Symmetry: C2
Subunit: 536 residues, 2 copies
């Protein structure tokens, strides 16, 4: 077992922050998996299918800052395509390792299984190009620096990368590196940074009331602490949108609720849109986040900070790291921001469900909500400190959270994980619940059983049968997907019953599945505003 390319990749992978590798084995990657098994630093996590594995890697990376997925050539990697695309869309650094047939077999154009039967072995590599920031076909002549290049780009951009690893290349001799892979964040040219500072210094100097709006890019680039410390040292009205929920302790002074354009609470609209200067840090104004692009923020009103560039008014300042821009604005806020913000039921409904959940969440919780009434209602939760709130409203692939929850719980075995998934969404990835049980995880899984696609019903055709789903027996799924599930399941239709059940499962001694019975047409306030925006 001499040190080889397979070991080098695992060594670099652990340097980047991944301690687990998710995926599904295949004959093209079994020999690589031996090194995964033998490594003391990386733990193999076999998944029930590749799509769920890619979702789990995404959720893992939202907890540890990095993740890796292993699939087999062809059938495996294409199954994971939707997961990698979601990671690219929402800036999640997931490494996709594809175990591939040996280079000799590829060069001969053999009619191998998991190919299109044409002797071409690069179709799927090229198909992955639009959803990765970097990719490589590893060869005996390039392996170690292509591994380092792809991973470094992933770290810089916080987006997926792709490595094709032929079985023969994986065994090629390598040398253990003396230096661990690190990025060492870059610095702007001092004249460019000064130009941004001077324009920002001027703009803040004439600001009467300043507000701060931060979102998911600060989460991806490890700037959560900086934004939290920013608002302590300089108290001002601040919010996030749905994607960036969890950046701020929502109990803190100056927070009035999540910003969702015209669907925001009145206090939030006045806090953010009513300020004459709004600092937008890592924001992307998507249709869902803005309730149909109904946000009212003008270029003159805003200073915007993006990963490699920042904007003051109509002028863009490129080549400025987002951390350096933030550090620059903090200084300036200290110098120019003065203000002090001066701040149960019977039958289950959306309204009393989220109110009941509000009393249940605690600091340290990991909360995942799927597209549907789950995410659109969870936006109204007031998150306490140290909450990781995982939602995917830009890509918006239902089924993500259940599988992502398995990844997040794997990343954080000592934290309480709350899974809010609709009944429709959970069907898409249900087999990963078996993975949860096999690994003895204890998440609190709340299935919003409104018997179908309620969000689709509210958009169009409420009585149309294509908005119906097969009706599952949710509380019996754990006993079907495990020979001995240590799980406790309830079906609840009353709020007091839900509150009592939430008390029982508070300390997550066992996996809990709560089937929440909700009306077919019952709607959270944000989605009602969203549906109203879609008319004309």
């Amino acid at each position: 077992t001499p040190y080889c390319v397979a070991d080098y990749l695992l060594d670099r992978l652990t340097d980047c922050g991944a301690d687990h590798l998710f995926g599904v084995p295949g004959d093209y990657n079994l020999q690589f998996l031996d090194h995964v098994i033998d490594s003391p630093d990386i733990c193999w996590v076999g998944c029930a299918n590749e799509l769920n594995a890619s979702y789990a890697a995404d959720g893992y990376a939202r907890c540890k800052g990095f993740a890796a997925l292993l699939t087999t050539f062809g059938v495996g990697e294409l199954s994971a395509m939707n997961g990698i695309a979601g990671s690219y869309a929402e800036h999640v650094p997931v490494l996709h390792i594809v175990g591939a047939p040996g280079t000799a077999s590829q060069q001969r154009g053999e009619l191998l299984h998991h190919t299109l039967g044409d002797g071409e072995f690069r179709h799927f590599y090229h198909m992955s190009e639009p959803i990765t920031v970097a990719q490589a076909i590893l060869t005996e002549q390039n392996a170690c620096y292509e591994i380092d290049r792809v991973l470094t780009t992933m770290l810089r951009e916080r987006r997926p990368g792709y490595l094709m690893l032929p079985a023969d290349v994986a065994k090629k001799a390598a040398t253990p590196p003396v230096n661990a892979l690190t990025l060492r964040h870059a610095h702007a040219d001092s004249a460019c940074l000064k130009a941004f500072r001077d324009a920002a210094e001027n703009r803040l100097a004439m600001s009467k009331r300043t507000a701060l709006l931060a979102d998911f890019l600060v989460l991806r680039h490890g700037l959560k602490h900086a934004l939290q410390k920013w608002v302590k040292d300089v108290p001002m009205a601040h919010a996030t949108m749905l994607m960036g929920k969890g950046i701020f302790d929502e109990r803190h002074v100056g927070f009035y609720g999540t910003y969702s354009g015209s669907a925001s609470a009145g206090a939030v609209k006045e806090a953010i849109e009513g300020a004459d200067t709004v600092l937008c840090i890592g924001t992307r104004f998507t249709d869902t986040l803005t309730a149909g692009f109904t946000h009212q923020l003008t270029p003159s009103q805003t200073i915007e900070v993006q990963p490699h560039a920042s904007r003051v008014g109509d002028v863009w300042f490129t080549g400025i790291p987002m951390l350096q821009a933030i550090e620059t604005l903090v200084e300036l806020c200290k110098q120019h921001v003065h203000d002090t913000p001066v701040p149960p039921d019977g039958s289950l409904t959306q309204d009393n469900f989220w109110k009941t959940l509000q009393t249940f969440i605690r600091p340290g919780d990991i909360i995942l909500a799927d597209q549907g009434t789950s995410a659109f209602g969870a936006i109204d939760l007031r998150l306490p400190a140290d909450v990781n709130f995982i939602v995917q409203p830009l890509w918006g692939s239902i089924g993500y959270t259940l599988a992502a929850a398995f990844g997040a719980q794997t990343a954080c075995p000592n934290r309480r994980v709350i899974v809010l998934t609709g009944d429709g969404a959970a069907q898409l990835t249900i087999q990963e619940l078996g993975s949860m049980l096999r690994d003895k995880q204890h998440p609190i899984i709340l299935v919003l059983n409104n018997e179908g696609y309620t969000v689709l019903r509210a958009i169009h055709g409420p009585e149309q049968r294509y908005n119906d789903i097969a009706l599952w027996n949710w509380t019996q799924i754990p006993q079907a997907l495990s020979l001995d599930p240590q799980a406790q399941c309830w079906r609840v239709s009353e709020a007091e019953q839900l509150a009592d059940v939430l008390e029982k499962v508070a300390h997550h001694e066992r996996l809990s599945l709560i089937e929440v019975m909700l009306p077919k047409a019952d709607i959270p306030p944000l989605l009602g505003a969203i549906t109203k925006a879609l008319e004309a």
Copy 2:
């Protein structure tokens, strides 16, 4: 409800032979679905996820000759990518309809859900190019002739196509066509056909013993009856490989078993490889079908017929439709081939399981077997007449069989469907069993419970943990995935119990799930040869 592009596409869909549309709804395709519901010729079949829907469409198309899949932009289509790729690899005409945001939204580059957040709306269209024979983005200016062009190419090549249908385009006015879309077989240039005929006649005229080897391209191009009548009117030794199993009644004189290269039975090797002239009709010598490319057939020994070209010896004759080449060979064979063939246990093992299943299969069965010991053991079944045998050994995506069975049963509600899936494979697509139960299907599902991936164990690392799977409670899955399942499940560990249970379920009164307990290391004969070939 004026006739529009949505109605035109559905009308063309029925012309091609599809009575159902599989998929998963999304906001970008809800208005199109209204026309599917309202259509008297197309039945909407909602699936549990897009990957399964694409597998079901594939299995449907293998029964009706054509199928259609509907997904939503981005999250839907990328989930189905592995299914469409398998359809391309194995030449299955599945039409992928992608409901997309309106053209106005696309041209402004809006930050819409199900995008990468860059305003680009053609990423996924291009990513689908390598796995389709034709694709189009439908516009107001091209819709109806682009629909007809894509479908015609799909019919010509028997391979998937792709249509992007913006919601606004779907509502554009159209006119019902007077004439149904038809292919109208092409004809070879008569001099080109004559040249092939002269070369084939010379070769066959000095053939002492002639044999016929046919495979899956005969199935896809609707030539199963022609091949059957061929060997009836002209008795000779004949076989198929694994992909094309089901072309011939295997009880008939001249059939000695499936051909698998050096893994073939001794009589099969002598019947096919022992002939001085072998007619290879629609054959692709993949690694699995030939047990590691160990087939012994020389160019001078063979005459080969492919969809658009045929070969005699070392000379290729291009531009000849495969139907015309076969008709030429049939005439020549009637003249020049001077031939006449003239011909329970205790504990469950692979050996007695397949012998027990042999006594159970009947004419008219649809049999599906997944990659693993299932497909590799089913190759030894002696199929009676009128059996549709569905296997995917070129693409080889596990999980395909369970979902494709749902599609095949949908296509043929009056036929008995037998599903042979491993425990590993069924985990990948288990939620489609819920679709089976919702639609009151009565397949016979045999789950080969060997507690892990034994095919991978045979290949490499028998005791390695990556070859293990989560252990499910298979007989309890139907009652978890349906509120009132019409099903009966059994668990069997002895050959007599299996035969007894197969006795009970004979007439598919209800959905049957038989959990077959088999040893971890037990291997069917074909897979033993394959692993031996791997040692190279």
